[PDB]
Design a protein around this ligand. Structure first.
Ligand SMILES: CNC(=O)c1cc2c(s1)-c1ccccc1CC2
Ligand SMILES: *[C@@H]1O[C@H](CO)[C@@H](O)[C@H](O)[C@H]1NC(C)=O
Length: 356
């Protein structure tokens, strides 16, 4: 189990002003540290965050968090469940900022909610240095869904934080799971009123300014003010990072289809929707051609790395834990140890190892 620690700096808060925190399981015989960023969509205005506070309060507050949490998947310490990093120090950072880990504004008389996702990561890394992170050999910043996008938004800031604090030996790396989205056109137009069924562009646009969200520096200088929403999309922000980032992304992510307003009921799919789905898989495949460390199975699913059966899926005969191990080896063309694994078949579940 991972033990809950609320941030000693109580000025770094969740949405409702309650303190943020992190779950920790130390491994005294390891110099490898895995910091996982939880996901769970976001909210971009006062009245939509108010609704999130009624029925998703744990994603906005720490007042009801449990004292412990079970490490699953890549956060598991059993080698059977986690062949990759079972012996590493495990850190689970709950997502309680609703800002895709980008905000850096505190709750005041002008803000009903605090959006401090970017400062939460910074404060956790800071406070972990006194509990063993100072002697770390690799810091892997991982995350799923919104936490996956958060890795892309924060991995260079964490690396910049550690050098400026005098820890050049800590190799900061990123693992972004199911956070690689396309700002494509929906299959059927909808009215952007919520977070689930809104155009992925315009939702980020209003959120980033509601949050006062921050984006990585080189990406900010390319797109410049008013266009920082572009850096929330993997294929635009990834080329600007220097830190190594392994990208895990279903070719047919359920969250991607949701914001695209695609709903597979079970009826025979018409030509229009069939071409739309095949074109989506092709577009994602294209955005990953120049991503050397990637794992993209042709499945309709959502998230993977913290699921207990994340070992089952395979691309071209190689599992994700193996590809991540090969990635570790590449960072010390490997024989029989591939690191770029992207399916080429064009329909959901054409890979037989897809989750059922
Ligand atoms: C549990 N589902 C999530 O957490 C997220 C879903 C999406 C996210 S996060 C997203 C992130 C950046 C840009 C655009 C989007 C739209 C879809
Ligand atoms: C707490 O975090 C805030 C935001 O990063 C910072 O301004 C403040 O100095 C921190 N306080 C301490 C004691 O670290």
């Amino acid at each position: 189990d991972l033990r809950l620690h609320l941030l000693l700096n109580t000025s770094v808060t969740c949405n409702d002003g309650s303190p943020a925190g992190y779950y920790l399981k130390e491994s005294r015989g390891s110099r490898r540290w895995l910091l996982f960023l939880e996901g769970g969509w976001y909210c971009f205005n006062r009245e939509n965050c108010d609704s999130r506070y009624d029925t998703m309060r744990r994603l906005m507050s720490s007042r009801d968090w449990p004292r412990t949490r079970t490490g699953t998947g890549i956060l598991s310490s059993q080698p059977e469940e986690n062949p990759y990093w079972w012996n590493a120090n495990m850190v689970f950072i709950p997502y309680c900022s609703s800002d895709v880990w980008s905000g850096a504004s505190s709750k005041s008389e002008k803000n009903e909610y605090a959006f401090m996702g970017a400062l939460i990561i910074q404060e956790v890394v800071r406070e972990l240095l006194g509990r063993g992170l100072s002697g770390a050999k690799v810091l892997l910043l991982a995350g799923s869904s919104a936490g996956g996008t958060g890795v892309l938004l924060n991995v260079d800031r964490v690396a910049e934080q550690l050098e400026k604090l005098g820890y050049p030996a800590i190799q900061v790396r990123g693992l972004a799971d199911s956070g690689w989205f396309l700002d494509n056109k929906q299959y059927r137009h909808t009215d952007c009123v919520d977070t689930i069924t809104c155009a992925p562009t315009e939702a980020i646009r209003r959120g980033i300014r509601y949050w006062n969200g921050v984006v990585p520096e080189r990406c900010r200088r390319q797109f410049q003010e008013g266009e920082e929403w572009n850096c929330f999309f993997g294929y635009k922000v990834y080329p600007t990072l220097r830190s190594p980032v392994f990208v895990v992304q279903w070719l047919f992510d359920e969250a991607q289809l949701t914001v695209d307003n695609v709903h597979l009921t079970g009826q025979p799919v018409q030509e229009g929707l069939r071409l739309y789905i095949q074109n989506l898989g092709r577009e994602l495949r294209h955005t990953l051609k120049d991503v050397p460390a990637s794992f993209a199975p042709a499945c309709l699913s959502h998230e993977i790395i913290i699921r207990s059966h994340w070992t089952d899926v395979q691309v071209k005969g190689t599992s994700l834990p193996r590809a991540l191990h090969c990635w570790d080896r590449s960072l010390h063309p490997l024989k029989g140890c591939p690191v770029h694994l992207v399916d080429s078949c064009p329909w959901p579940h054409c890979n037989p190892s897809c989750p059922t």
